[PDB]
Design a binder for this molecule. Structure first.
Ligand SMILES: CC(=O)N[C@@H]1[C@@H](O)[C@@H](O)[C@@H](CO)O[C@@H]1O
Ligand SMILES: [Ca+2]
Ligand SMILES: [Mn+2]
Length: 242
């Protein structure tokens, strides 16, 4: 079994295991700020930032035909300091081609370029969407499972506990092809669950980059924070299949 795992209970500036792109920054207090916060202490609009694990992950093998099972857990907080103008845009856990650079920001969350369904994206994502775009359901925020498109194959509305820490668990079972995700707000005790069938061998390339991406809106003050406090990941790929 080919395995890879990492766990950050806190983030350290200078850690070479993480690749920061765009506006993402690790504070001295150990917090990963995906999108920029201005010197005045308020979130900046038109900001896009991503953080990738510095090593690619072997998710499936064409020779043996095996597929990896994986699990990721992370804690984040989104604080929307204003109710108007409408806050945007959200954050997303994603897996895609290696050596990837930020895509379009705003409603595309830094991982897509348009709202089309396109096999070539070869991207899988679990989002936490705060702004309702034309391709979105009316309810926000919502959790969504994105397969080669910003238009989710399935969504689950959730209530934001403003500025509070949320715990997320995303697990993929290769045998059943079920991607199941859970979001919990310890502060209120709220629990949300969502699941869908995803055949990763049909969606992702054999080796992928794993990361987190966040973005604020394209209109002035259409923003919020996208802070991550901890992140762990583990993938197990059976080397053979007899
Ligand atoms: C397509 C696109 O990125 N749209 C963005 C949307 O996501 C949101 O950020 C909004 C802020 O009011 O600005 C634009 O409409
Ligand atoms: Ca959206
Ligand atoms: Mn959405």
């Amino acid at each position: 079994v080919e395995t890879i795992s990492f766990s950050f209970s806190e983030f350290e500036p200078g850690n070479d295991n993480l690749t920061l792109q765009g506006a993402s920054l690790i504070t001295q207090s150990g917090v990963l700020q995906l999108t920029k916060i201005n010197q005045n202490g308020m979130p900046a609009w038109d900001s896009t930032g991503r953080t990738l694990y510095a090593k690619p992950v072997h998710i499936w093998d064409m020779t043996t035909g095996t597929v990896a099972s994986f699990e990721t857990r992370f804690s984040f907080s989104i604080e929307q300091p204003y109710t108007r103008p409408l806050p945007a845009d959200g954050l997303v856990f994603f897996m895609g081609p290696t050596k990837s650079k930020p895509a379009q920001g705003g409603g595309y969350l830094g991982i897509f370029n348009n709202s089309k369904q396109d096999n070539s994206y070869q991207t899988l994502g679990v989002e936490f969407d705060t702004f309702s775009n034309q391709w979105d359901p009316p309810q926000v925020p919502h959790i969504g499972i994105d397969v080669n498109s910003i238009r989710s194959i399935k969504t689950q509305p959730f209530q934001l506990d403003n500025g509070q820490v949320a715990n997320v668990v995303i697990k993929y079972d290769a045998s059943s092809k079920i991607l199941h995700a859970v979001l919990v707000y310890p502060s209120s005790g709220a629990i949300y669950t969502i699941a869908e069938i995803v055949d990763v061998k049909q969606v992702l390339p054999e080796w992928v980059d794993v990361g987190l991406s966040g973005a604020t809106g394209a209109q002035r003050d259409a923003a919020e924070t996208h802070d991550v406090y901890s992140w762990s990941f583990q993938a197990s790929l059976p080397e053979t299949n007899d």
